[PDB]
Design an enzyme around this catalytic site. Structure first.
Site, PDB file in Angstrom:
ATOM      1  CD  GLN A  19     154.929  33.882  69.161  1.00  0.00           C
ATOM      2  OE1 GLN A  19     154.504  34.979  69.485  1.00  0.00           O
ATOM      3  NE2 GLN A  19     156.235  33.634  69.011  1.00  0.00           N
ATOM      4  CB  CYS A  25     156.526  37.348  68.563  1.00  0.00           C
ATOM      5  SG  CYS A  25     158.322  37.742  68.675  1.00  0.00           S
ATOM      6  CG  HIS A 163     156.856  38.809  73.117  1.00  0.00           C
ATOM      7  ND1 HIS A 163     156.763  37.958  72.034  1.00  0.00           N
ATOM      8  CD2 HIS A 163     155.640  38.808  73.710  1.00  0.00           C
ATOM      9  CE1 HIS A 163     155.539  37.456  71.981  1.00  0.00           C
ATOM     10  NE2 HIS A 163     154.841  37.956  72.987  1.00  0.00           N
ATOM     11  CG  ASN A 182     151.315  37.795  73.893  1.00  0.00           C
ATOM     12  OD1 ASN A 182     152.085  37.781  72.929  1.00  0.00           O
ATOM     13  ND2 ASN A 182     151.596  37.170  75.047  1.00  0.00           N
TER      14      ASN A 182
HETATM   15  N1  LIG Z   1     166.003  39.125  72.982  1.00  0.00           N
HETATM   16  C1  LIG Z   1     166.130  38.707  71.674  1.00  0.00           C
HETATM   17  N2  LIG Z   1     166.527  39.714  70.816  1.00  0.00           N
HETATM   18  N3  LIG Z   1     165.862  37.319  71.238  1.00  0.00           N
HETATM   19  C2  LIG Z   1     164.939  37.017  70.121  1.00  0.00           C
HETATM   20  C3  LIG Z   1     164.462  35.584  69.805  1.00  0.00           C
HETATM   21  C4  LIG Z   1     163.472  35.474  68.557  1.00  0.00           C
HETATM   22  C5  LIG Z   1     161.940  36.140  68.433  1.00  0.00           C
HETATM   23  N4  LIG Z   1     161.024  35.972  69.492  1.00  0.00           N
HETATM   24  C6  LIG Z   1     160.717  34.638  70.080  1.00  0.00           C
HETATM   25  O1  LIG Z   1     161.267  33.512  69.715  1.00  0.00           O
HETATM   26  C7  LIG Z   1     159.654  34.697  71.116  1.00  0.00           C
HETATM   27  C8  LIG Z   1     160.211  34.961  72.418  1.00  0.00           C
HETATM   28  C9  LIG Z   1     159.585  35.909  73.374  1.00  0.00           C
HETATM   29  C10 LIG Z   1     159.525  35.907  74.637  1.00  0.00           C
HETATM   30  C11 LIG Z   1     160.127  34.864  75.565  1.00  0.00           C
HETATM   31  N5  LIG Z   1     160.299  35.180  77.073  1.00  0.00           N
HETATM   32  C12 LIG Z   1     161.283  34.584  77.614  1.00  0.00           C
HETATM   33  O2  LIG Z   1     162.030  33.866  77.097  1.00  0.00           O
HETATM   34  C13 LIG Z   1     161.571  34.728  78.983  1.00  0.00           C
HETATM   35  C14 LIG Z   1     161.367  33.811  79.871  1.00  0.00           C
HETATM   36  C15 LIG Z   1     162.535  33.257  80.587  1.00  0.00           C
HETATM   37  C16 LIG Z   1     162.343  32.164  81.613  1.00  0.00           C
HETATM   38  C17 LIG Z   1     160.952  31.618  81.952  1.00  0.00           C
HETATM   39  C18 LIG Z   1     160.699  30.570  82.861  1.00  0.00           C
HETATM   40  C19 LIG Z   1     159.254  30.051  83.094  1.00  0.00           C
HETATM   41  C20 LIG Z   1     158.986  28.925  84.067  1.00  0.00           C
HETATM   42  C21 LIG Z   1     160.105  28.347  84.803  1.00  0.00           C
HETATM   43  C22 LIG Z   1     161.507  28.817  84.615  1.00  0.00           C
HETATM   44  C23 LIG Z   1     161.807  29.894  83.680  1.00  0.00           C
HETATM   45  C24 LIG Z   1     159.796  32.217  81.207  1.00  0.00           C
HETATM   46  C25 LIG Z   1     160.001  33.278  80.222  1.00  0.00           C
HETATM   47  N6  LIG Z   1     159.159  33.364  70.977  1.00  0.00           N
HETATM   48  C26 LIG Z   1     157.989  32.696  71.591  1.00  0.00           C
HETATM   49  O3  LIG Z   1     157.228  33.232  72.359  1.00  0.00           O
HETATM   50  C27 LIG Z   1     157.839  31.450  71.159  1.00  0.00           C
HETATM   51  C28 LIG Z   1     158.667  30.297  71.716  1.00  0.00           C
HETATM   52  C29 LIG Z   1     159.721  30.305  72.946  1.00  0.00           C
HETATM   53  C30 LIG Z   1     160.376  28.964  73.261  1.00  0.00           C
HETATM   54  C31 LIG Z   1     160.066  27.673  72.460  1.00  0.00           C
HETATM   55  C32 LIG Z   1     160.700  26.330  72.766  1.00  0.00           C
HETATM   56  C33 LIG Z   1     160.262  25.077  71.746  1.00  0.00           C
HETATM   57  C34 LIG Z   1     160.812  23.683  71.918  1.00  0.00           C
HETATM   58  C35 LIG Z   1     161.795  23.409  73.082  1.00  0.00           C
HETATM   59  C36 LIG Z   1     162.191  24.562  74.032  1.00  0.00           C
HETATM   60  C37 LIG Z   1     161.684  26.055  73.941  1.00  0.00           C
HETATM   61  C38 LIG Z   1     159.043  27.767  71.265  1.00  0.00           C
HETATM   62  C39 LIG Z   1     158.390  29.003  70.939  1.00  0.00           C
HETATM   63  C40 LIG Z   1     162.139  37.523  68.004  1.00  0.00           C
HETATM   64  O4  LIG Z   1     162.580  37.698  66.865  1.00  0.00           O
HETATM   65  N7  LIG Z   1     161.816  38.509  68.853  1.00  0.00           N
HETATM   66  C41 LIG Z   1     161.959  39.918  68.500  1.00  0.00           C
HETATM   67  C42 LIG Z   1     161.234  40.934  69.457  1.00  0.00           C
HETATM   68  C43 LIG Z   1     161.488  42.399  68.918  1.00  0.00           C
HETATM   69  C44 LIG Z   1     160.647  42.935  67.762  1.00  0.00           C
HETATM   70  C45 LIG Z   1     160.888  44.337  67.242  1.00  0.00           C
HETATM   71  C46 LIG Z   1     161.992  45.215  67.898  1.00  0.00           C
HETATM   72  C47 LIG Z   1     162.822  44.700  69.036  1.00  0.00           C
HETATM   73  C48 LIG Z   1     162.622  43.333  69.576  1.00  0.00           C
HETATM   74  C49 LIG Z   1     163.507  40.190  68.663  1.00  0.00           C
HETATM   75  O5  LIG Z   1     164.065  39.962  69.696  1.00  0.00           O
HETATM   76  N8  LIG Z   1     164.145  40.764  67.467  1.00  0.00           N
HETATM   77  C50 LIG Z   1     165.647  41.084  67.596  1.00  0.00           C
HETATM   78  C51 LIG Z   1     166.390  39.915  67.153  1.00  0.00           C
HETATM   79  C52 LIG Z   1     166.415  39.491  65.812  1.00  0.00           C
HETATM   80  C53 LIG Z   1     166.434  40.536  64.567  1.00  0.00           C
HETATM   81  C54 LIG Z   1     166.456  39.915  63.155  1.00  0.00           C
HETATM   82  C55 LIG Z   1     166.460  38.419  62.986  1.00  0.00           C
HETATM   83  C56 LIG Z   1     166.447  37.487  64.171  1.00  0.00           C
HETATM   84  C57 LIG Z   1     166.421  38.000  65.589  1.00  0.00           C
END
Ligand SMILES: N=C(N)NCCC[C@@H](NC(=O)[C@H](CCCCNC(=O)Cc1ccc(-c2ccccc2)cc1)NC(=O)Cc1ccc(-c2ccccc2)cc1)C(=O)N[C@@H](Cc1ccccc1)C(=O)NCCc1ccccc1
Length: 215
Positions: A19, A25, A163, A182
């Site tokens: 993605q 996702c 996710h 994934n």
């Molecule tokens: N929690 C919610 N609800 N938020 C949703 C956000 C949107 C989308 N998913 C996503 O966006 C997933 C996220 C996924 C996972 C990310 N994990 C983490 O963040 C944890 C973590 C923390 C710290 C460290 C860390 C590491 C190292 C050091 C320090 C710290 C490491 C890991 N995306 C990705 O994996 C992609 C991604 C993440 C960041 C950046 C980025 C780019 C440029 C600059 C900076 C950052 C680019 C791409 C999404 O829509 N996901 C679905 C999942 C789902 C599907 C079906 C049922 C339930 C839930 C969702 O949540 N849906 C509900 C919400 C919604 C509904 C309608 C419309 C919009 C939104």
């Protein structure tokens, strides 16, 4: 239900996709479930368009690269009367104008099923239906840095899943796990897959937002 299940063995699963830097996702999890059900019906495995979902399913509730739900994607395919192939409508990792073209539609759906929120029910769906769309709590460094083994995060929550991914089976090691595809490319985890802890009190909420489309 069988002791072990792996739909990849039967041709229900396309290679791991990526993605990229976009919150799409939900679209990859949805195409994964549809690819499986379309295969079960026609015997042909065809990669589907995540871009089509990202660009066109806003009316159903999705927000392109800012998030969405697999159920919203399934409803879009039914509403829309079709979904384009991956080949015809390439992934761009950014939202653009809707370019759906029915001429290139290769999948459809007549609804979807939300599975009861119990690992037992998820196990039956996986054993009898094929790959299942699910949401897990990937809100931790450990998931981002995962490479191999049975993932078990002590701090995981079964209520804030963030996710969408795809359950393609389950099994046990010589200890039980869900086989999860994934959408972060094949360089993450085990060729893009993760073995999530199974039958450990719905670890990371794997069974709380499970569904599949009816084609
Ligand atoms: N929690 C919610 N609800 N938020 C949703 C956000 C949107 C989308 N998913 C996503 O966006 C997933 C996220 C996924 C996972 C990310 N994990 C983490 O963040 C944890 C973590 C923390 C710290 C460290 C860390 C590491 C190292 C050091 C320090 C710290 C490491 C890991 N995306 C990705 O994996 C992609 C991604 C993440 C960041 C950046 C980025 C780019 C440029 C600059 C900076 C950052 C680019 C791409 C999404 O829509 N996901 C679905 C999942 C789902 C599907 C079906 C049922 C339930 C839930 C969702 O949540 N849906 C509900 C919400 C919604 C509904 C309608 C419309 C919009 C939104």
């Amino acid at each position: 239900a069988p002791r072990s299940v792996d739909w990849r063995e039967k041709g229900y699963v396309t290679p791991v996709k990526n993605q990229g830097q976009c919150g799409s996702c939900w679209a990859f999890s949805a195409t994964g479930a549809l690819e499986g059900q379309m295969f079960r019906k026609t015997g042909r495995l065809i990669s589907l368009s995540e871009q089509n979902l990202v660009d066109c399913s806003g009316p159903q509730g999705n927000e392109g690269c800012n998030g969405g739900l697999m159920d919203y994607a399934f409803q879009y395919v039914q509403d829309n009367g079709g979904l384009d192939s991956e080949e015809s409508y390439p992934y761009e990792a950014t939202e653009e104008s809707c370019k759906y073209n029915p001429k290139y539609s290769v999948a459809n759906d007549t609804g979807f099923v939300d599975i009861p929120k119990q690992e037992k029910a998820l196990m039956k769906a996986v054993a009898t239906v094929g790959p299942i769309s699910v949401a897990i709590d990937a809100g931790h460094e450990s998931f981002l840095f995962y490479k191999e083994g049975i993932y078990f995060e002590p701090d995981c929550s079964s209520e804030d899943m963030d996710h969408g991914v795809l359950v393609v089976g389950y099994g046990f090691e010589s200890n039980k796990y869900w086989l999860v595809k994934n959408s972060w490319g094949e360089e993450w985890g085990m060729g893009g897959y993760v073995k999530m802890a199974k039958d450990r009190r719905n670890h990371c909420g794997i069974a709380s937002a499970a569904s599949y489309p009816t084609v």
